[PDB]
Design an enzyme around this catalytic site. Structure first.
Site, mmCIF file in Angstrom:
data_model
loop_
_atom_site.group_PDB
_atom_site.id
_atom_site.type_symbol
_atom_site.label_atom_id
_atom_site.label_comp_id
_atom_site.label_asym_id
_atom_site.label_seq_id
_atom_site.Cartn_x
_atom_site.Cartn_y
_atom_site.Cartn_z
ATOM 1 N N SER A 107 -5.845 -4.056 -4.126
ATOM 2 C CA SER A 107 -4.844 -4.710 -4.969
ATOM 3 C C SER A 107 -5.392 -5.812 -5.832
ATOM 4 O O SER A 107 -4.577 -6.121 -6.898
ATOM 5 C CB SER A 107 -3.650 -5.248 -4.200
ATOM 6 O OG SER A 107 -2.990 -4.106 -3.697
HETATM 7 C C1 LIG Z 1 -3.070 -3.853 -2.288
HETATM 8 O O1 LIG Z 1 -4.042 -4.263 -1.702
HETATM 9 C C2 LIG Z 1 -1.913 -3.225 -1.594
HETATM 10 N N1 LIG Z 1 -2.368 -2.680 -0.320
HETATM 11 C C3 LIG Z 1 -1.836 -1.576 0.157
HETATM 12 O O2 LIG Z 1 -0.914 -1.068 -0.425
HETATM 13 C C4 LIG Z 1 -2.430 -0.937 1.413
HETATM 14 C C5 LIG Z 1 -3.283 0.245 0.953
HETATM 15 C C6 LIG Z 1 -2.788 1.549 1.103
HETATM 16 C C7 LIG Z 1 -3.542 2.631 0.653
HETATM 17 C C8 LIG Z 1 -4.801 2.428 0.060
HETATM 18 C C9 LIG Z 1 -5.306 1.130 -0.082
HETATM 19 C C10 LIG Z 1 -4.542 0.035 0.355
HETATM 20 C C11 LIG Z 1 -0.830 -4.304 -1.475
HETATM 21 N N2 LIG Z 1 -1.630 -5.476 -1.251
HETATM 22 C C12 LIG Z 1 -1.527 -6.177 -0.017
HETATM 23 C C13 LIG Z 1 -1.855 -7.632 -0.237
HETATM 24 O O3 LIG Z 1 -1.377 -8.185 -1.262
HETATM 25 O O4 LIG Z 1 -2.621 -8.200 0.612
HETATM 26 C C14 LIG Z 1 -0.272 -5.706 0.770
HETATM 27 C C15 LIG Z 1 -0.488 -5.354 2.239
HETATM 28 C C16 LIG Z 1 0.792 -6.810 0.656
HETATM 29 S S1 LIG Z 1 0.283 -4.248 -0.072
#
Ligand SMILES: *C(=O)[C@@H](NC(=O)Cc1ccccc1)[C@@H]1N[C@@H](C(=O)O)C(C)(C)S1
Length: 242
Positions: free
Chosen positions: A52
């Site tokens: 992310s």
């Molecule tokens: C970005 O890192 C997101 N992570 C996920 O959606 C988990 C994931 C699923 C499949 C492949 C790769 C990663 C969002 N970012 C985090 C964050 O901001 O720390 C969340 C857990 C809030 S979701």
């Protein structure tokens, strides 16, 4: 096979006890002093998926190609129930960044040809530069970047007199502000990789009255969570320079 750790050479640090039962690295850069400060030089050079944290770049490309803009960072909900209740509403850039709304960034990506993105990743020296089948290539996949790169690359994308406009840089900045008091403004973005948590990030920058600093924290083991990376990041900036 083509994956390799960050080669390009450029003061170092011991934050081993803040990290405690987690493992990974920290990197910081002082604008004013033009120097890097790094905890764990070797780990700081290992390439991991940015997950992310790549939303930073997705947002920036989104504003550049005009896909989203000042007034219409909007994009509707597809009325699909995601676990996070913050994801289930209309979005704008600030909302989707603050709340790390995957669908919003994935819809920006949908509208961007592999050659604009590859060109961009090349001008920027964004790790690997390894796109995949070009789907969600940033979400634990082909594309990979080191903690050190996260810092150089972000600092260069924001500071260099470059093709992104000061205005899109400023809308991005707004979308990434996290804390503010009298002494400082702290900006950044969490990343959390997954049935397991194995790749946690927090990348950003802080403006004080005196100086401006970019930094990043990666986590690989212990509790590699976006959340913990931010805590560790905060304890380092406090125990160092207000
Ligand atoms: C970005 O890192 C997101 N992570 C996920 O959606 C988990 C994931 C699923 C499949 C492949 C790769 C990663 C969002 N970012 C985090 C964050 O901001 O720390 C969340 C857990 C809030 S979701």
């Amino acid at each position: 096979i083509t994956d390799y750790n960050y080669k390009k050479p450029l003061q170092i640090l011991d934050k081993s006890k803040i990290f405690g039962s987690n493992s990974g690295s920290f990197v910081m850069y002082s604008m004013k002093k033009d120097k890097y400060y790094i905890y764990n030089e070797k780990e700081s050079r290992k390439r991991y998926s940015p997950n992310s944290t790549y939303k930073i770049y997705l947002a920036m490309f989104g504003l550049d190609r005009h896909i989203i803009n000042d007034e219409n960072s909007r994009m509707s909900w597809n009325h699909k129930h995601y676990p996070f209740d913050a994801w289930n509403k209309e979005q704008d850039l600030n909302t989707a960044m603050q709340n790390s709304v995957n669908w919003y960034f994935e819809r920006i990506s949908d509208q961007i040809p592999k050659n604009y993105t590859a060109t961009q990743l090349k001008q920027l020296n964004y790790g690997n530069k390894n796109l995949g089948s070009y789907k969600s290539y940033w979400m634990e996949d082909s594309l990979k970047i080191s903690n050190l790169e996260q810092v150089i690359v972000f600092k260069n994308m924001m500071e260099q007199n470059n093709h992104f406009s000061k205005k899109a840089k400023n809308q991005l900045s707004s979308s990434l502000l996290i804390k503010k008091n009298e002494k400082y403004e702290l900006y950044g973005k969490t990343g959390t990789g997954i049935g397991k948590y194995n790749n946690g990030w927090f990348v950003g920058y802080v403006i004080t009255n005196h100086d401006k600093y970019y930094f990043a924290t990666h986590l690989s083991d212990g509790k590699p969570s976006g959340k913990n990376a931010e805590l560790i990041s905060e304890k380092i900036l406090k125990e160092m320079g207000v």
